[PDB]
Design a protein around this ligand. Structure first.
Ligand SMILES: CC(=O)N[C@H]1[C@H]([C@H](O)[C@H](O)CO)O[C@@](O[C@@H]2[C@@H](O)[C@H](O)O[C@H](CO)[C@@H]2O)(C(=O)O)C[C@@H]1O
Ligand SMILES: CC(=O)N[C@H]1[C@H]([C@H](O)[C@H](O)CO)O[C@@](O[C@@H]2[C@@H](O)[C@H](O)O[C@H](CO)[C@@H]2O)(C(=O)O)C[C@@H]1O
Ligand SMILES: CC(=O)N[C@H]1[C@H]([C@H](O)[C@H](O)CO)O[C@@](O[C@@H]2[C@@H](O)[C@H](O)O[C@H](CO)[C@@H]2O)(C(=O)O)C[C@@H]1O
Ligand SMILES: CC(=O)N[C@H]1[C@H]([C@H](O)[C@H](O)CO)O[C@@](O[C@@H]2[C@@H](O)[C@H](O)O[C@H](CO)[C@@H]2O)(C(=O)O)C[C@@H]1O
Ligand SMILES: CC(=O)N[C@H]1[C@H]([C@H](O)[C@H](O)CO)O[C@@](O[C@@H]2[C@@H](O)[C@H](O)O[C@H](CO)[C@@H]2O)(C(=O)O)C[C@@H]1O
Ligand SMILES: [Ca+2]
Ligand SMILES: [Ca+2]
Ligand SMILES: [Ca+2]
Ligand SMILES: [Ca+2]
Ligand SMILES: [Ca+2]
Ligand SMILES: [Cl-]
Ligand SMILES: [Cl-]
Ligand SMILES: [Cl-]
Ligand SMILES: [Cl-]
Ligand SMILES: [Cl-]
Lengths: 274, 277, 277, 275, 275
């Protein structure tokens, strides 16, 4: 016999330097208040009369979600180096995928009136971001002559140049359910302190495809080995998860969105004070 | 010449600390009793008259499958500072009966006209499995909060339009086979620390199903800290749903089609600081 | 200058302990004799009148292919404490004739009108192969328990609605070429410890087929313990099914189209504790 | 207690030997000037009357984008045994404005009837980019040699049926922004030793487009010999085309839709034997 | 300061033991001569009257391309214990002219009505290439044994219904450019020990084509014993077929469309025991 090691499993409370946060963000498809009958969907998509006359109704435009998570305060005085929270990894999941596995919800029939109803399908757009400040946005639209509703943030002084990349069309994703997906995208010329990931599939009637698991972690460190650094001890979580459109019996259509869960691991770092 | 080693093959028993279990779970599409004519399928999908009047008929809603496997007893009682627990380390899993879909003579809607083969199972698919040391924790979320769910399934309590998004009060455990509808419940990503789950969804009205099968693939169940599910009360929970698509009848009524899933799980005995008070 | 090595290429005869075998298996879609006009295809798919009246015609049901390859004799008898056995370590396999589908002049249904090319083979596809040291073990599972299978195929005995899911009594061995229907039998994942199998299915009414071909890919057959299939009685079992889709005739009758599969298996001699009583 | 290291985060200015450039290139689908109503789209696609009579209207042909970026001057003396050159070692690149396609209210053909959303941009897609130390070298190859190309694009000289395959005389340099049609010119794989290019095509009449976007991906530009593009005359060439699909109007006329592309290229100073 | 190394970039000629060859192969869809109006396409596909009466017209059948490249002469004496042979170790290969498909004005069938663009090339695709030290070995297998093949292509001898599966007598060598039909012949996996081949097929009536292009990818040609194709008689065999789909005319007649393929093969001299 000899003295040797054996590994016992127990609850381990992680180092003081490491923290995890969890959050969920509900979708902002247009009906953005939980009391609303069509919460989690847009209102019926109203189409343009013409190029010149294109005025989407209130609540018909899906917008990005954003949540600001206040982390534990690290610095008593900001005058010294300072400590900052560095986001190192994230686990994220689209919640409610299985809700689409439903052929009895009222709408257009797959075949005739004896069949199931057409499920959510068409254009999809799934993106998330984790950063130490608001996601920086670039404006670009399909048509500069659309008139955007009062309750969304649109491009200022829109002109045909906004159908391409105009460097004046910039914004911060600093309000939940206010920045339309069809107007704003991540600005790749900025966002040095944010990591973002997105996938788009278009088409009129395309089948949606989504996976879900609790086994996958995305590392947030950049090419220099540094994760997002949380300015003022605030963590920004942003996303949009448009699953497709639901078609009603009358052939009116509404966007369907799903919520997203985030689990972010952060660590305390010593940072030279700007 | 010299003395040297040669490797002889033989049956090896493996150590007492490791065990393997195998199980299969039959699908729960609505007709959940093997004596039923449409066992392995739902009843005909009945669609809503309206947003307000949406009452799925009994046995038209696919539900999750779950089995609880009783593992070998490890402890005399729960009084010691440490106990032994089974740790699930890996799983091999297979959807069974995929080839049954390779059938164009089953009665139904014709591909072309009445001289052609019949349309096979297609449309929305949903395949998921989980292996854990306790029930899979579920989150409720529905397409429509005004649906009236049948008494024989577990629905969200006191549904409101908020349940079309994530309401933290809509939570459940997958603790009954063939009772929790797929369209109401999904894995809760805010919990499930002691379960591993994996899922794939493809929608669309008539989409072709795609499935693979092999006995060569093993999934490791260890988490980011190197620890597998730990089996509380020496029970292993296997959960799944495998909706292959819908079958369309000649009259255009449609039924969900599900397939069984096989599991082979490897577990090892571990010393664990006693969690039980 | 100095003495040094240079690598010269030459024909090398491998060690006596290693052998390779090559074989091809022609498809068994229904017309299984090379003299038949529709060899490599099924007969026209006849569809069910009803759930209760569903009687596939003779030769309309694709079946698995199987070949048993007799390997070199290794033992004088089975009396010693150890014996020699062939261990299958790797396989190269290819579906042959893929390019034959690149044909829009074969008579059939038109893509557009009567001036256009004809619709090529498309729809449901099913590709699988197995390499083992004994027959592939099969599980039965059908779309409909009330189908009446023809006398010339091996069907599930005393079929009941439970056979639309997994019934553990519905088991068979793939021990006859062109006799076990693909739509009735699939690999049994609860057995097959001495076989490796691999399969892919894509369904749908008219889905485009996708196939690749190369001589650059080798699949390793060693299991999780580093052991390949061990060939009982010095026999190697090769199994497959390769359904490319259906061909549609102008009258809209449809026939399954299959393709042959080539195998190149590498085996090595091993000393094995004698399993034979 | 002991002396030891701790890793402090700070703003680090990269070594003098390394530089990064950022640029964006707007699409050149035919309406190539930001004052134009249909900027970012082609004009309506006019189809051939016949094989012999096929005359695309001006600005109906999507063309490649190119930008030449002037890098810091490295050599005041070009007569030494060696010179310095900028070597492009990696690139991050993104298609911008993908989310603009997530729009079912823009006027056009209806998905179902007049109560539904309108059909989004779909059909043929073509996405490519290149990073090089000199212009991208092009090979000409067309669907039909009897097409008559307009005078505002560069096309194949003395076109003949052989140009429906590879004729080695049909060669060009991508040296004008918005003038070389995608349907006439492709990268020449027999040249381009000093460029890296990457492209993806999916055809079909009405195919759904698929596009990803992230700031997490870097492509290494070093070749098989470990050498990146070397920038002749301290000029960096960025080339691309990003056709997202076509938009269909209610009248069923169709226009190509393109999107801009962003580039972030890292370069390092290298000693090079003087040519 | 000290003596130290710095890596200077320069033009290097590889060792005398290594050579690179570049080639392109134009497609052989039926119109195989660059003077033909429809060069790069087949003639209109004529469909069978029946099972028994199926006679494809001349030049309606896409065929494989092959080029035999003469390499530098290695042995003036062929009677020693060893000879030198070229060993192919890697290949870079690209389909050329993919962008030519990004064309909706070419005359044909309309996507929607007569105001819209025309349907692009789509349907069945077949892409393969091979690099070897001798002709690619072929296996014959057809959709229908009662087809009558024309006298300008090489087909199966004494065709019988068994040729709808694998009959071991139906074997050939790919030794003539543009004469072996794709629909009759495939690589023989039971031979081809001295060739590497790679192929991809996607069928369907109207399927969208998918193709990528880059100059960044190298395929290693070494087999499982670390040996590449050895070039018998100092000849390198390049084979391919690249069927992009079919073009549909307004009358609904259809023609196959093929594209050229580029090859860049690296070879090294090896000492080989004299056979
Ligand atoms: C996303 C969703 O739940 N859509 C509903 C839809 C909406 O509630 C409605 O369009 C918003 O005003 O309503 C659907 O059911 C309708 C009935 O509620 C109504 O009584 O009659 C309608 C007849 O055209 C229709 O049946 C719908 O529009 O199809 C059901 C759908 O799920
Ligand atoms: C999933 C399945 O087996 N579906 C059957 C279907 C069901 O048995 C039935 O719809 C509900 O129990 O029955 C099908 O055959 C029918 C005949 O059994 C009946 O006599 O007449 C019907 C006429 O519309 C029909 O032919 C069906 O509904 O198509 C066959 C199908 O496979
Ligand atoms: C898979 C195949 O070869 N199919 C053939 C088909 C078969 O020979 C037949 O269905 C077996 O009974 O025959 C096709 O051609 C037919 C002619 O042979 C017949 O003279 O007239 C038929 C009229 O509908 C038809 O044209 C077919 O059924 O389309 C040709 C097909 O490739
Ligand atoms: C790509 C794009 O923005 N297309 C517009 C289109 C263009 O403005 C037009 O083709 C360029 O000359 O115009 C569409 O709207 C049209 C109205 O502006 C016009 O008053 O009437 C037309 C009736 O057929 C049509 O409604 C269009 O052609 O559909 C809108 C489209 O987004
Ligand atoms: C692949 C190709 O270029 N196809 C052409 C086609 C060919 O020139 C023809 O099939 C060769 O025999 O011709 C198309 O244009 C035609 C006119 O040239 C002719 O004057 O009238 C035809 C009326 O049906 C037709 O418009 C064609 O057949 O559509 C154009 C096509 O691109
Ligand atoms: Ca910047
Ligand atoms: Ca939690
Ligand atoms: Ca077992
Ligand atoms: Ca060259
Ligand atoms: Ca051989
Ligand atoms: Cl703005
Ligand atoms: Cl609840
Ligand atoms: Cl049985
Ligand atoms: Cl030219
Ligand atoms: Cl022959």
């Amino acid at each position: 016999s000899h003295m040797g090691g054996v590994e016992v499993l127990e609850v381990r409370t992680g180092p003081d330097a490491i923290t995890q946060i969890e959050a969920y963000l509900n979708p902002r498809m247009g009906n953005n208040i939980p009391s609303e009958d069509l919460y989690g969907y847009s209102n019926s998509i109203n189409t343009a009369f013409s190029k010149a006359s294109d005025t989407p109704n209130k609540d018909t435009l899906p917008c990005y979600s954003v949540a600001v998570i206040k982390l534990p305060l690290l610095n008593e005085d900001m005058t010294c180096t300072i400590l900052m929270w560095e986001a190192v990894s994230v686990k994220t999941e689209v919640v409610g995928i299985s809700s689409l596995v439903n052929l009895h919800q009222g709408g257009k029939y797959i075949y005739g009136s004896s069949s199931g109803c057409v499920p959510v399908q068409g254009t999809t757009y799934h993106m998330f971001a984790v950063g130490g400040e608001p996601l920086e946005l670039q404006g670009l639209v399909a048509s500069s002559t659309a008139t955007y509703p009062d309750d969304v943030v649109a491009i200022k002084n829109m002109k045909p140049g906004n159908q391409g990349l105009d460097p004046k069309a910039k914004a911060l994703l600093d309000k939940d359910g206010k920045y339309p997906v069809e107007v704003w995208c991540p600005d790749p010329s900025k966002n040095e302190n944010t990591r973002y990931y997105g996938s788009f599939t278009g088409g009129a009637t395309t089948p949606p495809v989504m996976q879900f698991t609790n086994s996958v972690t995305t590392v947030l460190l950049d090419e220099n080995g540094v994760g997002p650094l949380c300015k003022g001890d605030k963590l920004f979580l942003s996303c949009a998860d448009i699953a497709g459109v639901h078609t009603n019996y009358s052939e009116t259509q509404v966007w369907r969105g799903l919520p997203r869960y985030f689990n972010v691991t952060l660590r305390k770092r010593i940072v030279k004070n700007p």
